[PDB]
Design an enzyme around this catalytic site. Sequence first.
Site, mmCIF file in Angstrom:
data_model
loop_
_atom_site.group_PDB
_atom_site.id
_atom_site.type_symbol
_atom_site.label_atom_id
_atom_site.label_comp_id
_atom_site.label_asym_id
_atom_site.label_seq_id
_atom_site.Cartn_x
_atom_site.Cartn_y
_atom_site.Cartn_z
ATOM 1 N N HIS A 51 1.585 9.148 1.686
ATOM 2 C CA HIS A 51 0.581 8.957 0.663
ATOM 3 C C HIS A 51 0.892 9.966 -0.437
ATOM 4 O O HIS A 51 1.295 11.096 -0.139
ATOM 5 C CB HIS A 51 -0.820 9.236 1.212
ATOM 6 C CG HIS A 51 -1.146 8.422 2.431
ATOM 7 N ND1 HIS A 51 -1.887 7.259 2.385
ATOM 8 C CD2 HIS A 51 -0.816 8.575 3.742
ATOM 9 C CE1 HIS A 51 -1.994 6.749 3.605
ATOM 10 N NE2 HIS A 51 -1.347 7.518 4.458
ATOM 11 N N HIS B 262 0.823 -1.197 0.000
ATOM 12 C CA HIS B 262 0.000 0.000 0.000
ATOM 13 C C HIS B 262 0.860 1.250 0.000
ATOM 14 O O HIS B 262 0.602 2.181 -0.782
ATOM 15 C CB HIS B 262 -0.957 -0.033 1.210
ATOM 16 C CG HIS B 262 -1.674 -1.342 1.372
ATOM 17 N ND1 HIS B 262 -2.659 -1.774 0.506
ATOM 18 C CD2 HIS B 262 -1.548 -2.314 2.307
ATOM 19 C CE1 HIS B 262 -3.112 -2.950 0.903
ATOM 20 N NE2 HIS B 262 -2.450 -3.305 1.989
ATOM 21 N N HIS C 168 2.918 10.812 7.293
ATOM 22 C CA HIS C 168 2.288 10.433 8.547
ATOM 23 C C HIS C 168 3.314 9.794 9.468
ATOM 24 O O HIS C 168 3.841 8.719 9.161
ATOM 25 C CB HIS C 168 1.157 9.445 8.278
ATOM 26 C CG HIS C 168 0.006 10.072 7.599
ATOM 27 N ND1 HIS C 168 -0.968 9.345 6.933
ATOM 28 C CD2 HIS C 168 -0.335 11.375 7.494
ATOM 29 C CE1 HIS C 168 -1.851 10.200 6.442
ATOM 30 N NE2 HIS C 168 -1.500 11.434 6.780
ATOM 31 N N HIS D 155 5.184 6.823 7.136
ATOM 32 C CA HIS D 155 4.917 6.487 5.749
ATOM 33 C C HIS D 155 4.331 7.728 5.085
ATOM 34 O O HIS D 155 4.039 8.730 5.741
ATOM 35 C CB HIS D 155 3.959 5.302 5.658
ATOM 36 C CG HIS D 155 2.637 5.624 6.254
ATOM 37 N ND1 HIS D 155 2.372 5.452 7.589
ATOM 38 C CD2 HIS D 155 1.532 6.196 5.716
ATOM 39 C CE1 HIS D 155 1.152 5.913 7.841
ATOM 40 N NE2 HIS D 155 0.613 6.380 6.727
ATOM 41 N N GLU E 298 -3.998 13.357 1.738
ATOM 42 C CA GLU E 298 -5.239 12.838 2.309
ATOM 43 C C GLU E 298 -6.050 13.983 2.913
ATOM 44 O O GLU E 298 -7.175 14.258 2.476
ATOM 45 C CB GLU E 298 -4.896 11.739 3.313
ATOM 46 C CG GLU E 298 -4.197 10.574 2.652
ATOM 47 C CD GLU E 298 -4.430 9.267 3.358
ATOM 48 O OE1 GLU E 298 -4.100 9.188 4.561
ATOM 49 O OE2 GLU E 298 -4.945 8.341 2.705
ATOM 50 N N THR F 117 -6.480 6.091 8.211
ATOM 51 C CA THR F 117 -6.970 6.363 6.857
ATOM 52 C C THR F 117 -6.897 5.156 5.937
ATOM 53 O O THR F 117 -7.294 5.258 4.764
ATOM 54 C CB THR F 117 -6.241 7.541 6.215
ATOM 55 O OG1 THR F 117 -4.908 7.118 5.963
ATOM 56 C CG2 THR F 117 -6.301 8.783 7.069
ATOM 57 N N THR F 118 -6.429 4.023 6.444
ATOM 58 C CA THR F 118 -6.454 2.757 5.735
ATOM 59 C C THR F 118 -7.195 1.746 6.587
ATOM 60 O O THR F 118 -7.186 1.851 7.820
ATOM 61 C CB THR F 118 -5.046 2.225 5.405
ATOM 62 O OG1 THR F 118 -4.255 2.184 6.594
ATOM 63 C CG2 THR F 118 -4.349 3.082 4.412
HETATM 64 C C1 LIG Z 1 -2.298 -0.068 10.784
HETATM 65 O O1 LIG Z 1 -1.616 1.087 11.268
HETATM 66 C C2 LIG Z 1 -1.877 2.285 10.657
HETATM 67 C C3 LIG Z 1 -1.223 3.378 11.194
HETATM 68 C C4 LIG Z 1 -1.426 4.645 10.668
HETATM 69 C C5 LIG Z 1 -2.308 4.807 9.611
HETATM 70 S S1 LIG Z 1 -2.594 6.440 8.971
HETATM 71 N N1 LIG Z 1 -2.555 6.363 7.352
HETATM 72 O O2 LIG Z 1 -1.481 7.235 9.445
HETATM 73 O O3 LIG Z 1 -3.900 6.844 9.403
HETATM 74 C C6 LIG Z 1 -2.964 3.720 9.059
HETATM 75 C C7 LIG Z 1 -2.743 2.453 9.592
HETATM 76 ZN ZN LIG Z 2 -1.121 7.382 6.465
#
Ligand SMILES: COc1ccc(S(N)(=O)=O)cc1
Ligand SMILES: [Zn+2]
Length: 257
Positions: free
Chosen positions: A93, A61, A116, A91, A103, A195-196
Site C-alpha cells: 500500500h 487495488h 504485507h 503486496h 496503513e 485491510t481491504t
Molecule cells: C483477500 O486477501 C487479502 C489478504 C491480505 C489483505 S491485507 N491488506 O494484508 O490485510 C487483504 C486481503
Molecule cells: Zn495489505
Amino acid sequence: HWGYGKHNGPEHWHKDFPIAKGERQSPVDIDTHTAKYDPSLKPLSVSYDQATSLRILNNGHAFNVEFDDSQDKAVLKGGPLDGTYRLIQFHFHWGSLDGQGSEHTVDKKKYAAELHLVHWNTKYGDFGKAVQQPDGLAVLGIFLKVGSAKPGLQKVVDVLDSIKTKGKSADFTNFDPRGLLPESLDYWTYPGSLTTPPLLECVTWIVLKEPISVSSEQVLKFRKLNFNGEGEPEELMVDNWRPAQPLKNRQIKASFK
Ligand SMILES: COc1ccc(S(N)(=O)=O)cc1
Ligand SMILES: [Zn+2]
Ligand SMILES: COc1ccc(S(N)(=O)=O)cc1
Ligand SMILES: OC[C@H]1O[C@@H](O)[C@H](O)[C@@H](O)[C@@H]1O
Ligand SMILES: OC[C@H]1O[C@@H](O)[C@H](O)[C@@H](O)[C@@H]1O
Ligand SMILES: OC[C@H]1O[C@H](O)[C@H](O)[C@@H](O)[C@@H]1O
C-alpha cells in the site's frame, strides 16, 4: 465497486461490508509507549529459503506477487503464532506523496508505503477455509521509508510497466522475498483484520519495527500503475491505504524489551 476514491473509499465500505465497523479492524495506530513487552512470545521464524514465486498481478487495488502455496515452501512460525503459516502472496500500500501511504502508523507517523506478506494457517487446509477462522491468517507488515534504494525490490519495480492496468499479470518466477526484509525482526503484534474488503477478522498482525529504505525512484514507479483497466481513462494507483481504525478491546504486544 469498492476502492479508494471519494465515492467508493474506506468511509463507504461499511455499507457493503458491515464488519468495517467491527471489534477487530485493521490497520491501527501503534502507540509505542502503550505497547508492552511480552515475554511469552516465542522467537519469530521467517523461513523463506525455498519460496517459489509464480506471477505478479494488478488486481485493480494493488499488485500481488503470488507464491506456490501447495506445500510448506515459505513459512512463518513462532512469535505469537501457534503452528505453521504458509506464504501465499505479498503486496504493498502506498501514497501519492512520500508523507503518506502506510496503513499502520507508529505514534501517528505515516510511512511512505507498507509491505504485507500474507500467510495462512496450514491447519485449515486452504486460504478460503482459513478466512473462516479467528487465527486463519498471519500478515507480516513492513514499513517503507524513502532514502537509499532497496536492491531486492528492483525486480518488482522493473516488471510494473508490464502490468500497468487492472487485470494484467506477468510471470514472476525466481523472486526471493528475503530481499525485502530489514535487518531486525523486532515487532509489534495484535489481532486484527484484512485491510481491504471483505475486511475479515482473521489476522494475527506482526508489524516489524525497523522500516526498509527504498529510493524515491522505486516508489515513483509504484505510482505509475493504474487502478483502471486497459483502454479506460487513467486513474493512477496511489493512496491505496485504509486509515487507522479504533483499537477497541485490544492490546499491542512488543517482542522487544
Ligand atoms: C483477500 O486477501 C487479502 C489478504 C491480505 C489483505 S491485507 N491488506 O494484508 O490485510 C487483504 C486481503
Ligand atoms: Zn495489505
Ligand atoms: C456503486 O457505488 C458503490 C459505492 C460504494 C461501494 S462499497 N460499499 O464501498 O463497496 C460499492 C459501490
Ligand atoms: O530464486 C529465488 C529463491 O528461490 C528459492 O526457491 C531458492 O531456494 C532460493 O535460493 C532463491 O534465492
Ligand atoms: O491483569 C494483569 C494483566 O493485564 C493484561 O491486560 C496484560 O496484558 C498483562 O500483561 C497483565 O499481566
Ligand atoms: O524474479 C522475478 C523476475 O525478475 C526479473 O523480471 C527477471 O527478468 C524474471 O525472469 C523474474 O521472473
